[PDB]
Design a protein around this motif. Structure first.
Motif, short mmCIF file in Angstrom:
data_model
loop_
_atom_site.label_atom_id
_atom_site.label_comp_id
_atom_site.label_asym_id
_atom_site.label_seq_id
_atom_site.Cartn_x
_atom_site.Cartn_y
_atom_site.Cartn_z
N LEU A 198 85.76 67.55 81.76
CA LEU A 198 85.92 66.19 82.26
C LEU A 198 84.66 65.73 82.97
O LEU A 198 84.11 66.46 83.81
CB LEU A 198 87.11 66.13 83.24
N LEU A 199 84.18 64.53 82.64
CA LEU A 199 82.97 64.00 83.28
C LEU A 199 83.29 62.72 84.04
O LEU A 199 84.13 61.92 83.60
CB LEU A 199 81.89 63.75 82.21
N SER A 239 86.91 73.07 83.56
CA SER A 239 86.01 72.75 84.66
C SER A 239 85.88 71.24 84.84
O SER A 239 86.54 70.47 84.15
CB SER A 239 84.63 73.36 84.39
N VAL A 240 85.01 70.84 85.77
CA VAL A 240 84.78 69.43 86.05
C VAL A 240 83.35 69.23 86.55
O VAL A 240 82.76 70.13 87.15
CB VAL A 240 85.77 68.92 87.10
N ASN A 241 82.78 68.06 86.27
CA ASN A 241 81.41 67.76 86.68
C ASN A 241 81.16 66.26 86.77
O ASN A 241 81.78 65.46 86.06
CB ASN A 241 80.44 68.37 85.67
N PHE A 242 80.23 65.89 87.65
CA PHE A 242 79.86 64.49 87.85
C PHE A 242 78.35 64.34 87.71
O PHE A 242 77.60 65.25 88.04
CB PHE A 242 80.30 64.02 89.25
N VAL A 243 77.91 63.19 87.21
CA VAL A 243 76.48 62.95 87.03
C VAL A 243 76.14 61.48 87.26
O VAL A 243 76.91 60.74 87.87
CB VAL A 243 76.06 63.37 85.62
N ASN A 244 74.97 61.07 86.76
CA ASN A 244 74.53 59.68 86.92
C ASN A 244 74.85 58.87 85.67
O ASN A 244 75.05 59.42 84.59
CB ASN A 244 73.02 59.64 87.19
N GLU A 245 74.89 57.55 85.84
CA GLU A 245 75.19 56.65 84.72
C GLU A 245 74.35 56.99 83.49
O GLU A 245 74.83 56.89 82.37
CB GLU A 245 74.91 55.20 85.14
#
Length: 100
Positions: free
Chosen positions: A39-40, A71-77
């Motif tokens: 999931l992002l 798992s899970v992760n976040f980033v930039n546009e």
């Protein structure tokens, strides 16, 4: 449908105190997708992302709405965009019907 409301509301219980954080960045985004056991979610803030990835485990809760999140992760546009850009020329080639 209720999914987001299910997985997301799950976080509430988790961050039912980290308000300030919410009122900070997470506020009210609108860019997140699931379709690869992963999931992002949008997150440009360098700091917010630092801590989050330093120790979060959004799977510790999101592992209830699904069989078992990986798992899970976040980033930039920009980065996030690279994630959905991976898809080549093909895409939703699947053709079904609510009446098989």
């Amino acid at each position: 449908m209720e999914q987001f409301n299910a997985f997301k509301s799950l976080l509430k219980k988790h961050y039912e105190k980290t308000i300030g954080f919410h009122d900070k960045y997470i506020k009210d985004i609108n860019r997140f997708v699931f379709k690869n056991n992963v999931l992002l979610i949008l997150l440009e803030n360098e700091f917010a992302r630092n801590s989050l990835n330093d120790n979060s485990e959004i799977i510790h809760l999101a592992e209830s709405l699904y069989e078992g999140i990986k798992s899970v992760n976040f980033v930039n546009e920009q980065d996030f965009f690279f994630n959905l850009a991976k898809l080549e020329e093909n895409s939703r080639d699947t053709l079904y019907q609510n009446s098989g």
